[PDB]
Design a protein around this ligand. Sequence first.
Ligand SMILES: CC(C)(COP(=O)(O)OP(=O)(O)OC[C@H]1O[C@@H](n2cnc3c(N)ncnc32)[C@H](O)[C@@H]1OP(=O)(O)O)[C@@H](O)C(=O)NCCC(=O)NCCCC(=O)O
Ligand SMILES: CC(C)(COP(=O)(O)OP(=O)(O)OC[C@H]1O[C@@H](n2cnc3c(N)ncnc32)[C@H](O)[C@@H]1OP(=O)(O)O)[C@@H](O)C(=O)NCCC(=O)NCCCC(=O)O
Ligand SMILES: [Co+2]
Ligand SMILES: [Co+2]
Lengths: 144, 144
Amino acid sequence: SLTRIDHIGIACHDLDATVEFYRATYGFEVFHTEVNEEQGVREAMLKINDTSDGGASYLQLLEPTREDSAVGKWLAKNGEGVHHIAFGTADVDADAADIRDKGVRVLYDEPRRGSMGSRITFLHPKDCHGVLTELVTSAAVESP
Amino acid sequence: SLTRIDHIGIACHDLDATVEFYRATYGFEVFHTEVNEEQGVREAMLKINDTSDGGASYLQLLEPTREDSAVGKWLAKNGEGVHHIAFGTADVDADAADIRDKGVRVLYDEPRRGSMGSRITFLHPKDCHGVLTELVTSAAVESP
Ligand SMILES: CC(C)(COP(=O)(O)OP(=O)(O)OC[C@H]1O[C@@H](n2cnc3c(N)ncnc32)[C@H](O)[C@@H]1OP(=O)(O)O)[C@@H](O)C(=O)NCCC(=O)NCCCC(=O)O
Ligand SMILES: CC(C)(COP(=O)(O)OP(=O)(O)OC[C@H]1O[C@@H](n2cnc3c(N)ncnc32)[C@H](O)[C@@H]1OP(=O)(O)O)[C@@H](O)C(=O)NCCC(=O)NCCCC(=O)O
Ligand SMILES: [Co+2]
Ligand SMILES: [Co+2]
C-alpha cells in the first residue's frame, strides 16, 4: 500500500544555488546529498516532516550530471520546476506488480537504487494524467 | 515556520476521471471536494498521510471552472500535471511577511480562503526556481 508522500522531485540548473534558496527562504536544511550516476543527477534531500507510517517527506532537488539524462532532457524542454512526485510503501515490489496489472506502465522490471539506499520504480507520466510518479521503499524499515 | 508538505496541487482536465484514476490505481479515497469560484477550480483533496506537526498531506486535484483562471491558463499551456506545492504552517500571516522581507513576491497582501476554510497565500514561481509555492494554515489548529 502507498502510505505517504515520500518526496517531491524538483529539477534545477544549479543544485548549490537552489539548496541555498530553500535554506535562506524557508529554513530547510540539507538532510543528505549524493550523486546517482545511473539516473544522471546530483541530489540534495531536504526533510520537511515525519509521517504517520514511520517515514518522512522530503524535497528532492536534482541537477543533471549530463544533458542526455531524464532530468537533463526535462530541464532543457521545461526549465526548472517540479519533475516528479514519490509515494512511499513498505513493499515497492508488490505495489509495482499490482499497478503493472492495472495497465499503468512500470518503467523498471525490478526496483533500482534511489536516495539513501532506497529501492524505487516509476510510473509513466502519460499513464498518470501527466505526473511522473515514483514508488519508493526506504532502505531502513519504518515503525508507523 | 513551515512544518510540513501540506499538499501537491495537480491540474487535470476532468476531476471525476482523475479522482477515479487515483482511487483505482493507488486506493486513495476522496477526503473532501469543493468549488472555489474566486480561484476558478473544482477540487478534490485525497489524504495520503498524517504529519509530525499534527497536520496532514494531501493530493489536491484541480479542474478549472473557466479558461480565464490560474489553472485554466496553465492547463492550456502545459497540459495535465503538477501545478504547485504547498507547505503548512501554524501562522501563514507571519511566515508570508518574513518571506516578503526576503524579496520573494508574495501574491496576496492578506491570506485568502483555500480548501476546508484554510488560509493560503502563494509565492511567485519565478522567485522560487520555477515552483509555484503555496503557504497554508489549516482552519483547525493542529496538535504536533
Ligand atoms: C518518463 C520518461 C520515460 C520520459 O522519457 P522520454 O519519453 O524519453 O522523454 P520524452 O521527452 O520523450 O517524454 C515522453 C513524453 O513524456 C512527457 N514527460 C517526460 N518527462 C516528464 C515528467 N517528468 N513529467 C511529466 N511528463 C513527462 C513528455 O513531455 C512527453 O510527452 P509528449 O508525448 O507530450 O511529448 C523518462 O524521463 C524516465 O524514464 N524517467 C524516470 C527516471 C527519472 O526520472 N530519473 C530522475 C529522477 C531520479 C530519482 O528521483 O531518484
Ligand atoms: C503564478 C501566476 C501569477 C501566473 O499568472 P500569470 O503570470 O498571469 O500567468 P503567466 O502564464 O503569464 O505566467 C508568468 C510566468 O509564470 C510561469 N508560471 C505560471 N504558472 C506557473 C506554475 N503553476 N508553476 C510554474 N511556473 C508558472 C509561466 O510559465 C510564465 O513564465 P514565463 O515568463 O517563462 O512565460 C498565477 O497563476 C497565480 O496567481 N497563481 C496563484 C493562484 C493559483 O494558482 N490558484 C489555483 C490554485 C488554488 C489552490 O491551490 O487552492
Ligand atoms: Co525521486
Ligand atoms: Co493548493
